[PDB]
């Protein structure tokens, strides 16, 4: 039931959300873990190596470059963490055999990052999993998150809402197509962006490092 405009936007997003791989040596991280203070050195990389993907994905979002310049910065400063939690969640249930559950905890350190990072990311994943959401839903739901016109430091909210709007519009349809049985699927997807905004306090901010 999507319109040309939507199917076009969707494909574009899918495509882009895809050039970020390489699922093979996500096994180097999956099994056989050189653990402990080793494990730090890897994530710190991985993190870092998530920003460059994030920003590549964002530049190619229909209308992004056309935004202001600082607006562009403030978007991304606002999304970096949210969008990493959303990446994790896809992994934690879409990749990986049958969940429960990396369960390293008897190996959690700081960063500073302790045990109040573990628990958050847990409720969240299990709740996203509970949504049994397809990749298209991960892709769009991610652009919805970057293109958020209520980030602090935006000057042209309506410039950003014009861009977010169509993507919300598509996601609604997909929902209303792939699962008409439960007319409250879209509302749950939105609902989760809120647990995202929340974690933005317990992960005070990921500035500086590394």
């Amino acid at each position: 039931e999507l319109t040309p405009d939507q199917q076009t936007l969707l494909h574009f997003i899918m495509d882009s959300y895809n050039k970020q791989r390489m699922p093979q040596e996500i096994t180097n991280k999956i099994l056989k873990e050189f653990s402990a203070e080793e494990n730090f050195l890897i994530l710190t990389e991985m993190a870092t190596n998530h920003v460059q993907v994030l920003v590549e994905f964002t530049k190619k979002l229909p209308g992004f470059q056309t935004l202001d310049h600082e607006d562009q910065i403030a978007l991304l400063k606002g999304s970096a963490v949210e969008a990493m939690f959303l990446r994790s969640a896809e992994i934690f249930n879409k990749k990986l055999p049958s969940g429960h559950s990396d369960l390293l905890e008897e190996r959690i350190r700081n960063s500073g990052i302790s045990d109040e990072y573990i628990t958050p990311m847990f409720s969240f994943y299990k709740s996203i999993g509970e949504l049994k959401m397809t990749q298209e839903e991960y892709a769009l739901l991610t652009a919805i998150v970057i293109l958020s016109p209520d980030r602090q430091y935006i000057k042209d909210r309506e410039a950003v809402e014009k861009l977010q709007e169509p993507l919300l519009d598509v996601l609604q349809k997909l929902c209303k197509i792939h699962q008409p049985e439960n007319p409250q699927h879209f509302a749950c997807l939105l609902g989760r962006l809120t647990e995202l905004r929340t974690f933005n306090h317990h992960h005070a901010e990921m500035l500086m490092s590394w």
Partner: peptide, 16 residues
Amino acid sequence: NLGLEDIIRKALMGSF
């Protein structure tokens, strides 16, 4: 004393 926002400025082209 960077901190983040610079990183993003760079990543927007330079730091590739």
